[PDB]
Structure 1
Amino acid sequence: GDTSKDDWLWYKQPASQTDATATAGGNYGNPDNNRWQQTTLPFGNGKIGGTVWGEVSRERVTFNEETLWTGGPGSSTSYNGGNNETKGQNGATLRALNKQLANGAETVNPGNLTGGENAAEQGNYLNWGDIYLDYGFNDTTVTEYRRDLNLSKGKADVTFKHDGVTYTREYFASNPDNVMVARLTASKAGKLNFNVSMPTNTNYSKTGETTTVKGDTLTVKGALGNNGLLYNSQIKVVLDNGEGTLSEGSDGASLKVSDAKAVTLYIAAATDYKQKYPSYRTGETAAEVNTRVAKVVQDAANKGYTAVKKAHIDDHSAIYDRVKIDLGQSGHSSDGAVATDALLKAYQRGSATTAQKRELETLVYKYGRYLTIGSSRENSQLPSNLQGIWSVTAGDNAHGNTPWGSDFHMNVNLQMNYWPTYSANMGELAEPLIEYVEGLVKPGRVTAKVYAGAETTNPETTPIGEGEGYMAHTENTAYGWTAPGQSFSWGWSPAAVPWILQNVYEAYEYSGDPALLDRVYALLKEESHFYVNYMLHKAGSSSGDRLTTGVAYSPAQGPLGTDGNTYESSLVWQMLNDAIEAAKAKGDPDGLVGNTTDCSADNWAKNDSGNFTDANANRSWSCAKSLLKPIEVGDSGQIKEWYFEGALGKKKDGSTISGYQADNQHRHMSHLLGLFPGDLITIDNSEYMDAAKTSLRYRCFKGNVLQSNTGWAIGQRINSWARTGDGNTTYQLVELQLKNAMYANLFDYHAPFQIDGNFGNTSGVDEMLLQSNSTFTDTAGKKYVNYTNILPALPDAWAGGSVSGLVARGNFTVGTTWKNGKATEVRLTSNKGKQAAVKITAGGAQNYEVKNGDTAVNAKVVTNADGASLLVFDTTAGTTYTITKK
């Protein structure tokens, strides 16, 4: 085909010869594993993944399947989600601690709020192994070598000339046909000779593994030692025209292909995992999995390469091509095009041209969308983990050979994985996250009982929404590991659930979809019930006059075990906000919205049995929300991180806060979640926004110099800065992520490789060009909720450009063209007919007018007390409105 217009990451040498000189990080002491993370090119179908090395002779595709997880039922005889009954005492331990805080304690020792001690029960995500395609060349001398990742077509390509013959390789993983394809060619008949093997990683425990050949198919199968999970992979080799010979390798164990010209390999893998509490198994036998995997490769071969490839590209491109961004970038087809590793190095050196700078920025942005398609499909069994689905490291136990188990880290990281999912028009890719959080409900009720005394009768059978609450913490797995971890500071964080419910609720916010409303309403209802009934209390003297969440830590500074904090109260505020919105949208069938009549923190008074002593008092969602008072501006003009805080880093009396990083540059900004991702601190509130900008500047600058960071920290700061409207600072953060936190394969790093920052980048660029989360209040006091904000934080660096296919809440598809730093055209497609309300930050919307083609729309200009303006107008589903300067 014509690929000149496609987006490529491309390299002029194999992975083995690609620069892997950036910081390796923990677990990457093996030069070979470090080389994997910095140089290989990922692809996937949401379920299986490969990372292509592009080696000339011993070619290698590191292989993953999303469900290959140790831990869980079968890892012990008593697996119970890590919950420690002796520590939790059915809520008694937490209750006693909160009473101390209520009676005036500033801090308590939260040391016994722990669990999850058994690393075998926790487990971790495993690298499955490798596909090795050994051409058995005498040397690796080549010319005209290239390897690429075609982001537009979802496939990896390798080409080179060796001893008069041109060898090509193409790799993709089809979602529609559930199968990995390797298309391999030589330019001369009989010159394609290779050995096919697929060894499982040797660093995890396996029982009864066998490798059998039954040309045309190689099968590896066994069960995991740690938990008995059955696994099965197969490679079917189809000689393209039955030309060439298929034999068995001398080792076992491999398939040899001789004297061929071209072949297609069909690769499949599965386990008997099911996301289903409490057994987490399909109930299949090994033979039954073997048969299932066999049907995948056979079906694909019956379809054939042309049809499978066509179906793959149609499917991949349908999602990939929804968004287009032009900031003036060069690309792989440009005259004087630069390979992607050389591009990164030029960007780091300061010698990249404007076009090349825009190419790197724009490629990293696109890669975040690409990586979502590869790791998180609407039919994936699990959401993307700390590494999407791609890993090379393996070991049996949690906190072992793989950094943080490549797990589901739900106190910023899993959240970040789903920051760009809706705004960058990949909404259905959020489905496995929604299903994952749904999946936490049953096991989470066990935790909620043990640690907070919220008992759901028969947690297994009680529908989501009808139980007493579900609790989960930071480290999560495939197996309902909802217990807190073994040390409080990093292990305990029940507001992780509220937080991930933002990602979930946004699936409804951006779509208006009725079936999603029911699902998000059920999750929000039970979690809001949980907080109102079991987690909120009237604060003691240290935290002023308010309900707080009680025993808390602000990751990861200050005192352990304070009386609530801004981080948690901001999250609980948002959750109640969204639960109320969801209930209103349903006609508040359960009568839970209530009001603020006779509403007081005293209404939460409990006896020693945990029962309310004023049982019939108002504890409705509206009342509880109103009592949080999450944002308090402190004596330094900052957002307080603690309710006992005065000036920054100090208590009200001027003494210093212990555990506060006194240089003011603590890496986390847990108290700013109301600015991003939430709706608590917005451009529409200058008091709060000015204070949030003050907090951000203290955290992010040393002197007047903006500081670099990596991984999730830089991703969070880009998005947080975007919400302020400071496009220039936001952009300088983007530059700093590209310079200091991207490997040659554009994997984001911490170090080591962590995918969160890849997805965070894509989201941050979205939030520069379009915001949709805030609420505008006009001079008449009318609210415009989730108004469309065009170019809210456009950097001066991007003087002109266009973007199309972004999504705004209310379900509008948005395109924008700008020149000389100001919008020239907005194209707003109303997908659901919701009333439009449009701010034009780069232009002033009062200077614009609205048309439906030739029809002039009678848009009204409304303005707020601060003198900013919205264009408001009714819309019809399916219609595009063009907004242009008068």
Structure 2
Amino acid sequence: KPSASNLIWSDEPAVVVYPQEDKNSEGSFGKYRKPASVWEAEGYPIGNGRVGAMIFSAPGRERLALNEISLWSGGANPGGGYGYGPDAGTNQFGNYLPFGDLFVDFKKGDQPASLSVEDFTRSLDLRDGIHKVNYKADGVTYDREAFSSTPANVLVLNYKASKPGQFSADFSVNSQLGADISAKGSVITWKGMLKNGMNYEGRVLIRPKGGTLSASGDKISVKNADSCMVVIAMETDYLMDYKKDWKGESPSRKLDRYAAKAASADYAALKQAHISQYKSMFDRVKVNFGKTEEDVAKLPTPKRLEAYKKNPADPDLEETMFQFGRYLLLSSSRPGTLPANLQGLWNDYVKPPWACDYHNNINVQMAYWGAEPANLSECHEALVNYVEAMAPGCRDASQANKGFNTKDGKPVRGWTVRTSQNIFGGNGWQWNIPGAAWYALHIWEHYAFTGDRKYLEKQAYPLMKEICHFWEDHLKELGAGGEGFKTNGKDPSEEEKKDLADVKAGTLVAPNGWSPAHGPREDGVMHDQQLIAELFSNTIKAARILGKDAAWAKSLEGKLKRLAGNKIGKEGNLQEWMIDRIPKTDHRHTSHLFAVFPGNQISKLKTPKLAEAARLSLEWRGTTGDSRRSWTWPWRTALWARLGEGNKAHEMVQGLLKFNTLPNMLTTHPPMQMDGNFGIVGGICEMLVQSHAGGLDIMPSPVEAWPEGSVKGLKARGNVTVDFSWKDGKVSNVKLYSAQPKVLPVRVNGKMTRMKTLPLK
């Protein structure tokens, strides 16, 4: 019997096509028409934070769409444009690129093997992070295994058979970038230099047991082998340092230091080291939402999803969805490497949607919503190190914009970002003015969840203060009654001026802001005011914790108190602008709800009137049309949970699975966008534990779809690990762990208590 959770599998062979459309037969496409549709829905991903593959397993052929997180076109992009493509130069924005493909054409003898076999299954086992394939043919049981090893820093494949000498396959390497491919001995090497100057090189090392190996052309033929281990190594010359012009040691020199050593190891030792390392991150969080009926839990993932759309009652599938997001984050974000982009690190497009880049409008943030609460804190370091490394480029583009100039005609202090960012300090497309403030929330929350004072002083606080310096220069002061208020560049009408009657002189507002996705360009947009208030408050807290800059922090506290705050509209909704406009109930964005999540300003415990207004705004929002996005469901899940609506929050988990989830459990915008997989981790975490409103809140509101369950290993602010179970309407077995003894205010079962922490194990 198959596992009811933590296992994504299918009894149907994956559709195997070349990414180049003209290279496939019509039969090879299956039900699809485009090779990008095949890639996003059929592949199973593996990764170790730097190298990964989307796996397409079939009895006759196998495709591994390879990736290295640093393979990027483009460059500094001084013009601030959004041009990309595989030939984008240093003057263009660029995009994440596919490293290549490994095609395995299995053979019986000298003829191709059968395409249909018996009892075929392909599986991605989240319990050990291994892609597994199994089938039978002519009385022989074949088995394949694949994973991305962190300790070995390579991809490891292994093909076995129940009878000796029954493995034969042809290994070839495909490239969409015109790479120079050559096969000599037992290694296929492909390499190239992008138009922007970055060098890359990959190597496929073939290590069979028995049989004969031959390198004919640019392929390698294995015949009548007992088994076969394959090692895939990929490097670029990228270095996350602007001072070195983003160039480090050559990829060939790096591969010469470990690639052959990994291929010389015994496969059982590589797999043992991978499983041990992988479980050290995956097993940190265990969760159980209930039991699914065995008739449903035995279905393969594509059929189980179709069953979910008709009957969305599958707690074990939702646990798989939750853990899959943790799996994907740990497989694409590690300290020392680049952060996860729009698609984690998996991409076969030469020209991807939105350049598969770093979108700071929400996607990159969402990618790391579950990093802290789901106990993957070191994955968050990739984002902070990246924001710090990209900062010199952001200062260049920010200071070059005269629209940011201060009142004295001088360039602005600090920096902010455009909507899109690459890995060379380049910024693309429109300006995202409060974007750097959003990064500062992530910068702070990493300290808030770990208590790492060294991190706060050495890296976090210097970045936060600089981002504060930008807003000290850019903030605009309004007179009494909002004298200088401007909307769309023009003064307020007589009716609009009535909403500004209570505006006190000296009020600070973000000038000429924009509430994401609609509305006029207008001062004091709630979205911007909430982000800046969160930035000033967290920076003042960091200064106090560090005992630093007492005079400046005292001044920033003054400015914080003068920032235009939230208002409740005449209809009871939380206002989105300083102008009490009619609620945009048909809109898919709730940008003025940032203060509820991921911001920490509005809460039912501390601000009950504002929280009721925010709940009204969300209640009047629909879940149809363009609201069915990969990023809408997880944001709305966390919002409903923080407003005390566990049932409404669970309905957004159902919506993500019903309308924006592919048969391989990857979330789709459309097309495939991993922000849904990432963000739903943070959303479900808020349904279980909240630690932002002055203490621990254990399951603040019940979830009728989860009548009985338990969780272990969730993280709370203050570096506290939380374990508990629940049955009926009550929570029991609450255990709090920390490195040092602590007493926390804990709200549980509708009662406010204080609890002591136990020693962490």
TM-score normalised by structure 2 residue count? 0.89
Name the SS for the 1:503 alignment partner.
helix
What is the match of residue 741 of structure 1? Answer: 660
Q: Report if the CA contact (8 A) 1:796-1:821 is conserved.
A: no
What does 1:19-418 align with in structure 2 at a 5 Å threshold? 30-73=33-76, 79-80=77-78, 82-83=79-80, 120=88, 121-136=92-107, 137-201=112-176, 204=177, 206=178, 209-224=179-194, 226-240=195-209, 243-249=210-216, 252-277=217-242, 279-284=244-249, 288-330=250-292, 337-350=298-311, 354=313, 357-379=314-336, 381-394=337-350, 401-418=351-368
Q: 1: CA distance between counterparts of 2:477 and 2:427?
A: 23
Cα deviation 1:290-326 (Å, max 9, x = unaligned): 1321332212133321221111111110010011111
Structure 2 gap ranges (5+): 18-30, 407-411, 486-491, 493-499
Which of residues 496, 507, 510 in structure 1 aligns to 2:435?
496
What is the match of residue 453 of structure 2? Answer: 514
Which of residues 524, 533, 537 in structure 1 aligns to 2:473?
533
What is the match of residue 654 of structure 1? Answer: none
Q: CA deviation at 1:879?
A: 5.9
Q: 2: CA distance between counterparts of 1:283 and 1:317?
A: 32
What is the match of residue 859 of structure 1? Answer: none
Q: CA deviation at 1:122?
A: 0.3
What is the match of residue 7 of structure 2? Answer: 8
Q: 1: CA distance between counterparts of 2:53 and 2:510?
A: 43
Q: Report if the CA contact (8 A) 1:6-1:153 is conserved.
A: no
Q: What residue identity is the alignment partner of 2:579? A: F
Q: 1: CA distance between counterparts of 2:224 and 2:414?
A: 64
What is the match of residue 583 of structure 1? Answer: 543
Q: Report if the CA contact (8 A) 1:445-1:454 is conserved.
A: no
- May I ask how many residue pairs the two structures share in their alignment? 711
Q: CA deviation at 1:138?
A: 4.3
Cα deviation 1:580-601 (Å, max 9, x = unaligned): 111110013453211xxxxxxx
Which of residues 562, 567, 579 in structure 2 aligns to 1:644?
579
Residues 874 and 345 of structure 1: CA distance in aligned 2, closer, same or farther (over 3 Å): closer
Residues 833 and 451 of structure 1: CA distance in aligned 2, closer, same or farther (over 3 Å): farther
Q: What residue identity is the alignment partner of 2:675? A: D
What does 1:532-611 align with in structure 2 at a 5 Å threshold? 532-538=472-478, 540-541=484-485, 542=492, 544-545=503-504, 546-559=507-520, 561-589=521-549, 591-594=551-554
Q: Report if the CA contact (8 A) 1:810-1:832 is conserved.
A: no
Residues 805 and 334 of structure 1: CA distance in aligned 2, closer, same or farther (over 3 Å): farther
Q: Does the alignment pair 1:692 with 2:661? A: no
Q: 2: CA distance between counterparts of 1:199 and 1:118?
A: 22
Q: What residue identity is the alignment partner of 1:236? A: L
Name the SS for the 2:116 alignment partner.
coil
Residues 752 and 29 of structure 1: CA distance in aligned 2, closer, same or farther (over 3 Å): farther
Residues 272 and 29 of structure 1: CA distance in aligned 2, closer, same or farther (over 3 Å): farther
Q: 1: CA distance between counterparts of 2:158 and 2:320?
A: 26
Q: CA deviation at 1:763?
A: 1.0
Q: 1: CA distance between counterparts of 2:338 and 2:708?
A: 39
Residues 117 and 376 of structure 1: CA distance in aligned 2, closer, same or farther (over 3 Å): closer
Name the SS for the 2:438 alignment partner.
helix
Cα deviation 1:187-215 (Å, max 9, x = unaligned): 222221111112112xx4x4xx4222222
Q: CA deviation at 1:334?
A: 8.7
Q: What residue identity is the alignment partner of 2:465? A: K
What does 1:471-486 align with in structure 2 at a 5 Å threshold? 471-482=416-427, 485=429
Q: CA deviation at 1:522?
A: 1.0
Q: CA deviation at 1:32?
A: 2.2
Q: Report if the CA contact (8 A) 2:640-2:649 is conserved.
A: yes
Which of residues 718, 721, 736 in structure 1 aligns to 2:637?
718
Q: Report if the CA contact (8 A) 2:4-2:316 is conserved.
A: no
Q: CA deviation at 1:474?
A: 1.3
Cα deviation 1:50-71 (Å, max 9, x = unaligned): 1111111121111111011100
Q: 2: CA distance between counterparts of 1:515 and 1:566?
A: 33
Q: CA deviation at 1:165?
A: 2.3
Q: 1: CA distance between counterparts of 2:15 and 2:138?
A: 20
Q: 1: CA distance between counterparts of 2:267 and 2:185?
A: 19
Residues 49 and 17 of structure 1: CA distance in aligned 2, closer, same or farther (over 3 Å): closer
Q: CA deviation at 1:5?
A: 9.1
Structure 1 gap ranges (5+): 19-27, 74-78, 84-114, 395-400, 457-466, 486-490, 595-619, 650-660, 776-786, 846-869, 881-886
Q: CA deviation at 1:645?
A: 2.1
Q: 2: CA distance between counterparts of 1:879 and 1:809?
A: 15
Q: Does the alignment pair 1:633 with 2:562? A: no
Aligned residues: percent identity?
A: 33
Name the SS for the 1:375 alignment partner.
coil
Q: Report if the CA contact (8 A) 2:474-2:510 is conserved.
A: no
Which of residues 750, 753, 756 in structure 2 aligns to 1:871?
753
Q: CA deviation at 1:534?
A: 3.1
Cα deviation 1:371-402 (Å, max 9, x = unaligned): 011111223x21000000011211xxxxxx31
Name the SS for the 2:540 alignment partner.
helix
Q: 2: CA distance between counterparts of 1:527 and 1:683?
A: 29
Q: Report if the CA contact (8 A) 1:216-1:238 is conserved.
A: yes
Runs of 4+ in 1 over 4 A off after TM superposition: 2-6, 115-119, 333-336, 452-456, 873-876
TM-score normalised by structure 1 residue count? 0.77
Name the SS for the 2:552 alignment partner.
coil
